[PDB]
Amino acid sequence: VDYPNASHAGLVDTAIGPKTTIQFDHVFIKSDFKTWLAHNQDEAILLIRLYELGLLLQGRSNNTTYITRTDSKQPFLNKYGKLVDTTSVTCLDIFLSVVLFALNQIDSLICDFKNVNATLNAKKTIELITCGLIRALIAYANLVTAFSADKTALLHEILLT
Amino acid sequence: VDYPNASHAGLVDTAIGPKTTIQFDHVFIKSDFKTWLAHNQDEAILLIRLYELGLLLQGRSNNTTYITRTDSKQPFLNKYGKLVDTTSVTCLDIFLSVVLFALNQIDSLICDFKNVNATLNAKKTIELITCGLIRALIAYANLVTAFSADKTALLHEILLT
């Protein structure tokens, strides 16, 4: 536990670099936030899909190269690796705020919606939404708690530097 | 905006004390986390109800005075004010972690549950649960993002002290 590289070599978690750390003021720390992003790529991409939705609602909004189609997840796996490559706590703050703005919006929509076959397919719609919003919210609830945990570790390290 | 007390006095948000701030290492900051707790007492108490549930599952677990009944929210409004009176980021971390442990558990239960009148009332049960878990999760998603925001402000202030 204190000498983990010895442990493995007898009886990834020591790899240090941009995809496994965050920093504030060039004070780096091994990042739970990132480690969650590493074990939950599908859910990560889900929050990345919400990040895109959050920018459009606010009104904010290339280099595809191929003249033949390829994969529809291609774009979202590209962004996925730019997120993980990002160590700045200040940039990561932006990301999670935009994403939360989308979660609140989808929820405002559902709540609003709660207050023939069109209707039967319009109910089924909102029910898929609520299903996704659950998953994203537990993904968000878990991701940012880890991000919050990381900061309590950067708060400690700064005071000791 | 820069002189808000003048503004109000012509054309609560400057009150400084334990219920409106958090600190790390006696470095205080005006707290979004707290301000959310101030505008969402019902939802706050909901997360406090989950805090209690989170301790029991882990196995962790008085002074009621009255020999006549009173109110069933009495206990949870007492804890509500101990939370708001708490400025330590390190204590607040505990609280939100315990609460997240409960959210994950309720979700593990629902997922598990997805894989006569007893059954009809047992389905209705899990559906109320999912309804609450939504509300708590958006309450949690919003509360901790604000807590995370607070830390980005404590990270800044420390480096300037």
Numbering used by the authors:
A (entry chain A), B (entry chain A): 14 to 24, 33 to 82, 90 to 143, 192 to 237
Authors' own words:
The ToNV polyhedrin achieves the first requirement by forming a dense lattice, free from continuous channels, maintained in all directions by disulfide bonds, hydrophobic and electrostatic interactions, and domain swapping.
During initial analysis of individual crystals of recombinantly expressed polyhedrin, we noted the presence of a crystal population (approximately 10% of crystals which could be indexed) where the unit cell had increased by 3.5 Å in two directions, giving cell dimensions of a = b = 57.2 Å, c = 105.8 Å. These crystals diffracted weakly, yielding a dataset to approximately 2.8 Å. Analysis of the structure showed significant portions of the structure were disordered. At the N-terminus, only helix-α2 remained well resolved while the connecting loops and helix-α1 were not visible. The crystallographic disordering of these polyhedrin residues creates channels within the protein crystals. This increase in unit cell and the disordering of residues appears similar to that observed in a CPV4 polyhedra structure where similar changes occurred.
